[PDB]
């Protein structure tokens, strides 16, 4: 092996401006970061500027350094999709033709229609909502009629909420389950199906810890399957598992923000194991991005930012560290969709002693899972093209 452990951060939708295709999906103009630090009238980022995030594009307090730590460049995604699943699934080796869905209006009336002449029960709600807002409203009314409550939010989910004592656990999993069928179709995709039981009276209502998920298979075996398949580890941190359905995963540890993402990232360095560790910083897309927020999201990055510091400490000289993103969510941006952007790819090693250099552009996100494929002497994905040798 070149690096004994490579540990993957993903930066959830932190994306580096419109992408070549921007346009096909009402794109021009985004720019995740270049409008966070003109919103902030300069981004601190002093720890992604010494590895070299100016050298990519230059920004507002992110200058070009003459000797970056590492090796750096941008990567643009050839799949269809901008949405979170697409792009984890191209980084790990796959090409996704067919694009999952959000729905900002709600559900197409047939889907519905489907879900009730398959489950015998009406549905109630069909509009992007939070857990608090369509409970608060439509809650009794579940209660007083066995009606399902639907509803969505900006990623691309649908969301099947049930008073535990009026639709029982089982029969709210079984339902989830249809609903999971009937969205394998490319007019209904959704990434996710998922289970909201709640329980308590109107004006008091709480959803309970019986949540399930429903995902999709990733549409191939993955760098991580093959990974996993040759006994190596492959640790997931955060939303990983869940966006792979658990594909090529050896362990798995759950966060609740993106600090303790980065303290389960260090706990990994403390780790003897060989393979991949792989974390997705999810608060930058679903509290900043989706909200339309660029305050938020500037603060967050920085937060981001002032950790690294000790990761750069904790790294071997046969440890090598990737930092990118799978879309972009500009939180000034129209509507509350991902932005089909390029994303940045730095990467670094303390074997690296006279710095780094900028990397021909990558052409899909696949060349990161073809990267890590080559280090570890396992089959080449199909798709994507290995830097390891440029390093
Ligand atoms: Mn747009
Ligand atoms: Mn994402
Ligand atoms: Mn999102
Ligand atoms: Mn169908
Ligand atoms: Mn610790």
């Known amino acids: 092996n070149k690096y004994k452990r490579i540990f993957l951060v993903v930066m959830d939708s932190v994306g580096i401006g ?4 921007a346009e096909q999906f009402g794109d021009l103009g985004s720019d995740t970061i270049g409008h966070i630090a003109e919103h902030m009238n300069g981004l601190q980022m002093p720890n992604m500027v010494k590895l070299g995030l100016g050298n990519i594009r230059e920004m507002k307090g992110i200058s070009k350094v003459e000797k970056p730590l590492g090796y750096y460049t941008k990567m643009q995604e050839k ?6 699943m697409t792009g984890h699934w191209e980084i790990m080796g796959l090409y996704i033709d067919t694009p999952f869905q959000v729905f900002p209006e709600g559900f197409p009336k047939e889907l519905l229609d489907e879900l009730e002449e398959k ?8 509009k992007p909502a939070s857990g608090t807002e369509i409970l608060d409203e439509l809650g009794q009314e579940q209660m007083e009629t066995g009606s399902l409550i639907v509803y969505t939010a900006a990623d691309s989910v649908l969301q099947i909420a049930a008073h535990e004592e009026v639709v029982p656990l089982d029969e709210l999993y079984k339902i989830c389950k249809i609903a999971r069928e009937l969205t394998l179709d490319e007019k209904y995709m959704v990434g996710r199906v998922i289970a909201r039981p709640f329980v308590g009276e109107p004006g008091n209502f709480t959803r309970t810890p019986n949540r399930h998920d429903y995902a999709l298979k990733p549409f191939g075996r993955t760098v991580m399957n093959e990974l996993k398949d040759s006994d190596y580890d492959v640790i997931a941190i955060g939303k990983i598992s869940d966006i792979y359905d658990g594909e090529g995963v050896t362990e798995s540890l759950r966060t609740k923000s993106n600090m303790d993402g980065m303290d389960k990232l260090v706990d990994t360095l403390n780790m003897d194991f060989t393979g991949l560790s792989f974390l997705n910083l999810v608060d930058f897309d679903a509290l900043f991005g989706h909200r339309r927020d660029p305050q938020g999201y500037g603060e967050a990055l920085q937060e981001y930012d002032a950790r690294l510091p000790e990761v750069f400490a904790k790294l071997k000289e046969d440890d090598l560290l990737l930092i990118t993103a ?3 969510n500009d939180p000034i941006h129209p509507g509350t969709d991902h932005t089909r952007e390029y994303v940045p790819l730095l990467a670094y090693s303390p074997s690296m002693k006279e710095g780094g250099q900028e990397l021909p552009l990558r052409q899909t996100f696949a060349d990161i899972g073809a990267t890590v494929a080559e280090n570890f ?4 994905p199909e798709y994507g093209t290995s830097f390891l040798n440029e390093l």
């Open 18 to 21: 419109e992408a070549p295709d």
């Open 79 to 84: 799949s269809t999709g901008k949405d979170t």
């Open 119 to 126: 489950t015998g029960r009406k549905i109630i709600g069909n």
């Open 326 to 328: 799978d879309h972009g």
């Open 377 to 380: 002497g396992v089959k080449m």
